[PDB]
Amino acid sequence: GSHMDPLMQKIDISENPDKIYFIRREDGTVHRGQVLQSRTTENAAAPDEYYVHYVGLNRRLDGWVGRHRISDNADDLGGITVLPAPPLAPDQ
């Protein structure tokens, strides 16, 4: 949460627009979605939202989604539409 890495400067679209991005829905069920735009709010030092267009899914569903929801890999999101077992308060 400080100083943007010289590479992790938010996912770049101009490289694979066709590439389908996965987005974890609020309920939890992850679903495909094409990203077209993105904005880092006024602050522009942490905030950032990507416009997602769920493929096949209702157009109304389309909107803005936080970076945390979008990910190139599904496993990170929800392991392919599956809720991960809640941690029993892990601590050494």
UniProtKB/Swiss-Prot annotation:
Changing F22Y: In strain: Africa-0, Africa-3, Africa-4, Congo 194 and Mof.591A.s. There is a cross-link at K10 (Glycyl lysine isopeptide (Lys-Gly) (interchain with G-Cter in ubiquitin)). Residues 20-71 form the Tudor-knot domain. Ubiquitinated by msl-2. It is found in: Nucleus; Chromosome. Changing W64G: Abolished association with roX1 and roX2 non-coding RNAs and recruitment to the male X chromosome. Knockin flies show male lethality. Disruption phenotype: RNAi-mediated knockdown in male salivary glands, decreases chromosome X gene expression. Simultaneous RNAi-mediated knockdown of mof with RNAi-mediated knockdown of Mgtor in male salivary glands rescues the decrease in chromosome X gene expression. Histone acetyltransferase that catalyzes the formation of the majority of histone H4 acetylation at 'Lys-16' (H4K16ac), an epigenetic mark that prevents chromatin compaction and constitutes the only acetylation mark intergenerationally transmitted. Catalytic component of the male-specific lethal (MSL) complex, a multiprotein complex essential for elevating transcription of the single X chromosome in the male (X chromosome dosage compensation). The tudor-knot domain (also named chromobarrel domain) mediates association with roX1 and roX2 non-coding RNAs, promoting recruitment to the male X chromosome. It also potentiates the histone acetyltransferase activity after chromatin binding. Component of the male-specific lethal (MSL) histone acetyltransferase complex, composed of mof, mle, msl-1, msl-2 and msl-3 proteins, as well as roX1 and roX2 non-coding RNAs. Component of a maternal MSL subcomplex composed of mof, msl-1 and msl-3. Component of the non-specific lethal (NLS) histone acetyltransferase complex at least composed of mof, nls1, dgt1/NSL2, Rcd1/NSL3, Rcd5/MCRS2, MBD-R2 and wds. In males, interacts with nucleoporin Mgtor. Belongs to the MYST (SAS/MOZ) family. This is Histone acetyltransferase MOF. The gene is mof. The chain holds residues 367 to 454 of 827 of the full protein.
